[PDB]
Amino acid sequence: DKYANFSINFTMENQVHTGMEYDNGRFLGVKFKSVTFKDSVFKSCTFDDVTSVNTYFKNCTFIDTLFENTDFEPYKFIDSEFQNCSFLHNK
């Protein structure tokens, strides 16, 4: 029900995620299409070279996660909290 210590590049499609905990996950090269995260926690996750289309984070808490080379803009985050989060190369 919560997931940890993984790396992925495949792109789950048109999905709604609610109440998930991702401890220590790598989101490498993944292309989100119509994905929504709700009430979710990202602990020490990493997003590298991700793209997001019609994709949103709603009431989510990111902790010590890196956003490197993403397209994530502030509008894609809805009442979400960031703790200890770095943002590096934004396109």
């Binding site: 990493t46 996660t65 960031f82 703790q83 200890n84 989060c85 770095s86 943002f87 590096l88």
Partner: protein
């Protein structure tokens, strides 16, 4: 120029000597250290105090100096390094770090989110506060988690003044207070701090029986900043064989990176830095960015880099160390720096002279194998690529091109470095 030694004058001079923290003043006031009071083992004057009961230092003042009076001027100076506030529960949570209060009379130093506070109280419940505020919503801060010089002066005739790095921040009236009778002991401890992870670094505490003036304050500041030993970005002693992210002061928003290794390749400045944040708590420029410099000894036991030392500079690309070097004979004064695989560096100029100065920010002056000056290491633009170079232009005097900062990963900055 000469000037009068203000420190040996002080009525309390808290310092580390032999293997104890002790008072070097006439009065030899007794000093009780807590169990969990950590001393920096590279410079044991630097004291760390945690948010634990057992983390405290108690100075039992000699009766003669214990403060009880309506007229007696007194000042205080100490260096503090305050961690970035990381938790919302630190938003309105004043907590005292240095306590000299009895029955609500005395003085205390206390902190809060973004604040340093001097509080004064008389036996008639009348009080004054003077306050240093600093933001955590700032690209690069002079204050967050960096050693800052704090002076407070009190003249009973009129004002209480607070100084940060010998610079007047704030002054307030106190001639209304009456008899302030302070404590018999000074307590260094974090009192009433809700952040269970809160800690401070503190060094060179001094209590004075007069009101220090501007010049005396600046004298203190200059002398205690210990030029001749280079500092890193947080102000700790710069060390050998220790990796650092780099910052140029002409362009702080860029970080050093290399296109490719080898003499074909060059090292340049790349922007932008990006930002590190916690929702509603801080938003700063990221500091753990780019290649990493490691300083290499080219005789002292100490791992400490001193002014005029001669060193080699390593560069970390992909968890592998290469050598900083260049060909002094190449065209034009500005000599483009590269990152050569160490066993293939041969005749290339690589010996760097580290610089602290008067005073100045860190500098690097590259040299041939004959001790000739290639130039201070800065940068230059070659069709809008800001390549790291070495120019004696810098020497012969945008002189912020050669002024650098060395940033180790510090537990009080909180950022997560991107790794390979």
């Amino acid at each position: 120029g000469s000037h009068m030694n203000i420190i040996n004058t002080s009525i309390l001079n808290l310092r580390y000597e032999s293997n104890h923290l002790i008072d070097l003043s006439r009065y030899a006031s007794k000093i009780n250290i807590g169990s969990k009071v950590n001393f920096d083992p590279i410079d044991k004057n630097q004291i760390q105090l945690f948010n634990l009961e057992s983390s405290k230092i108690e100075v039992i003042l000699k009766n003669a100096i214990v403060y009880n009076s309506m007229y007696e001027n007194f000042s205080t100076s100490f260096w503090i390094r305050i961690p970035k506030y990381f938790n919302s529960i630190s938003l309105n949570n004043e907590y005292t770090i240095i306590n000299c209060m009895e029955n609500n009379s005395g003085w205390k130093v206390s902190l809060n989110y973004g604040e340093i506070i001097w509080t004064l109280q008389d036996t008639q419940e009348i009080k004054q506060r003077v306050v240093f505020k600093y933001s955590q919503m700032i690209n690069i801060s002079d204050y967050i988690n960096r050693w800052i010089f704090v002076t407070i002066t009190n003249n009973r005739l009129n004002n209480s003044k607070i100084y940060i790095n010998g610079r007047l921040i704030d002054q307030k009236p106190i001639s209304n207070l009456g008899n302030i009778h302070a404590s018999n002991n000074i307590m260094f401890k974090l009192d009433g701090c809700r952040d269970t992870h809160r800690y401070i670094w503190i060094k060179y505490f001094n209590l004075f029986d007069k009101e220090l003036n501007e010049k005396e304050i600046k004298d203190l500041y200059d002398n205690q900043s210990n030029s001749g030993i280079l500092k890193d970005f947080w102000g700790d002693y710069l060390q050998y064989d220790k990796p650092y992210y780099m910052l140029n002061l002409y362009d702080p928003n860029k970080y050093v990176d290399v296109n490719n290794v080898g003499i074909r390749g060059y090292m340049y400045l790349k922007g932008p830095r990006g930002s590190v944040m916690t929702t509603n708590i801080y938003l700063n420029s990221s500091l753990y960015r780019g290649a990493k410099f490691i300083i290499k000894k080219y005789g002292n036991k100490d791992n400490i880099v001193r002014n005029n030392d001669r060193v080699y500079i390593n560069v970390v690309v992909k968890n592998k160390e290469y050598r900083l070097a260049t060909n002094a004979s190449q065209a034009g004064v500005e000599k483009i720096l590269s990152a050569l695989e160490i066993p293939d560096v041969g005749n290339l100029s690589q010996v760097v002279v580290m610089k602290s100065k008067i005073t100045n920010k860190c500098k690097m002056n590259l040299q041939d194998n004959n001790g000739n000056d290639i130039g201070f290491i800065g940068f230059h633009q070659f069709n809008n690529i800001a390549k790291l170079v070495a120019s004696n232009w810098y020497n012969r005097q945008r002189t912020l091109g050669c002024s650098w900062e060395f940033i180790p990963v510090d537990d009080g900055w909180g950022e997560r470095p991107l790794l390979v």
